[PDB]
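User: Show me an example of a complex going from sequences to structure tokens.

Assistant: Sure. Here are the input components:
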Amino acid sequence: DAQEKLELAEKKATDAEADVASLNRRIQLVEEELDRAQERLATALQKLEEAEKAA
Amino acid sequence: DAQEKLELAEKKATDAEADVASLNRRIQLVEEELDRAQERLATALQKLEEAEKAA
């Protein structure tokens, strides 16, 4: 039982770590996409200022 | 040893869990900002369309 629990805890660690890595990938993807949304936002806001300023 | 490996693997998983949990908090917060930035962006872009119509 300790050994199976170990294989399962190791599996859980494997999966938790797979999830750490898969999420780290995803967190980074949302951080990168966030930076892009923020850059696009700064761009949209600058364009908004240009359009609004044109107006 | 199975029990120590189990406690350790449980901790590999607990730490991996703490890390994925940290990451899950980061994806939730960053992705929430991705979406808020995307929404702010959509807002800036919608405002841009209106600002351009106003232009």
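The lines above are the inputs; the final block is the predicted structure for all two components together. The longest helix of chain B spans residues 2-54.
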